């Protein structure tokens, strides 16, 4: 089981926002051009659901609205089918029988022939499948073979939707690395739920995430994590983006912990505008099975100096070493160049680190500006 500091760092990510619904472009505009704006799409979702309910009830206007929506949806679907058929015909016309090929992944420079093993990664373009496939690259691979081991699948959907309105956003990601000796299986799933919309109430969203990790030969143990987060806007004002989350982590051999080490954490997140300061805060507390760790992150901005960015972090171990960190960032434009500076100060170790990045695209004036290391470099025998 990882230390409580890792869990406290995971929980204190910052201000969060769950993913909303997805909307079709043909149905929303009834065959007309539309633009992008949130609040007007979830309104369309809930409005069409309510109008369907009222039409079932018997209101003639709801029936008329639903009939118009159905006509627009049918026209859009037929148009898309015709477009798909035309695209397939055009693809057949261009290449008579030859399926389209894909560009191989470029690994980089090496003493082996750079053009070698390119034929292995050049495959025919796949069909319009829902899943997405990505290759995973290991740190060190075989000397005389390709260094790509394993694969990862990514999938997204919005099921339980009627005519493109409503549904439950759902994301899945599975990384699988299987060989004759080892086995690495990492799965993650996200589910979104919406309770109300600004026209019909407040913005109430609940996100449930579940991630499990299995490493068969090395660890021989599996890990499960389940987190539920609730977000609501304007709890103590016009807009505060209040959020509260609860996470449970288990390291049992299988299924239930069965005496496995458990951990429970809770996090709170809120942003507030006081005077000239727009402060965003996220504070979490985690307890493993019996030390307890605390974490807090804050982002502070000053409207009179928009170029300066200030972040504060406070981490407390079990009672009780408190680590405080302050980070400041600034940017400016030099003569034909841009310089960005970052200062990080830690009081636990009493240390200050200053980094200045420089980019010049007009000439090499900055190169002639800095020449000390050349003289500083000595043979020394």
């Amino acid at each position: 089981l990882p230390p409580m500091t890792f869990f406290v760092e995971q929980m204190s990510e910052g201000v969060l926002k769950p993913e909303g619904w997805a909307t079709m472009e043909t149905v929303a505009g009834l065959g007309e051009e539309v633009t992008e704006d949130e609040g007007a799409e979830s309104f369309n979702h809930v409005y069409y659901r309510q109008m369907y309910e009222l039409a079932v009830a018997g209101d003639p206007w709801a029936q008329r609205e639903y009939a118009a929506m159905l006509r627009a949806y049918d026209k859009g679907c037929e148009s898309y089918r015709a477009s798909y058929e035309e695209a397939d015909v055009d693809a057949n016309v261009e290449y008579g029988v030859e399926s389209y090929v894909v560009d191989p992944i470029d690994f980089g420079p090496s003493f082996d022939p750079e053009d070698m093993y390119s034929h292995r990664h050049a495959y025919a373009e796949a069909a319009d499948a829902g899943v997405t496939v990505i290759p995973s690259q290991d740190y060190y691979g075989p000397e005389h073979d390709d260094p790509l081991n394993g694969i990862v699948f990514q999938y997204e959907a919005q099921p339980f939707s009627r005519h493109g309105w409503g549904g439950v956003p759902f994301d899945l990601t599975v990384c699988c690395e299987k060989d004759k000796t080892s086995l690495c299986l990492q799965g993650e799933t996200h589910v979104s739920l919406v309770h109300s919309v600004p026209p019909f109430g407040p913005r109430h969203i609940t996100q449930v995430t579940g991630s499990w990790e299995v490493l068969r030969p090395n660890i021989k143990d599996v890990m499960y994590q389940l987190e539920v987060d609730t977000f609501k806007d304007g709890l103590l004002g016009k807009s505060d983006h209040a959020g509260c989350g609860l996470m449970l982590a288990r390291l049992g051999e299988g299924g239930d912990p069965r005496k496995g080490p458990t951990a429970v954490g809770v996090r709170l997140q809120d942003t507030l505008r006081v005077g000239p300061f727009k402060l965003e805060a996220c504070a979490s507390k985690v307890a493993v099975q019996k030390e307890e760790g605390w974490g807090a992150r804050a982002f502070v901005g000053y409207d009179w100096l928009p170029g300066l960015g200030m972040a504060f972090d406070f981490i407390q171990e079990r009672t009780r070493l408190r680590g405080y960190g302050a980070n400041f960032t600034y940017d400016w434009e030099a003569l034909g160049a841009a310089f960005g500076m970052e200062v990080d100060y830690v009081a636990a170790s009493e240390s200050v680190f200053v980094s200045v990045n420089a980019f010049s695209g007009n000439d090499y004036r900055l190169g002639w500006l800095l020449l000390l290391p050349a003289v500083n470099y000595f043979k020394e025998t």
């Binding site: 109430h204 609501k232 809770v266 605390w294």
Partner: peptide, 19 residues
């Protein structure tokens, strides 16, 4: 700090669930 954090979390959860 543990008691304050737990109380704040419980109060926030209750307030969010009430609405």
């Amino acid at each position: 700090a543990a008691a304050f954090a737990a109380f704040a979390g419980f109060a926030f959860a209750a307030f969010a669930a009430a609405g």
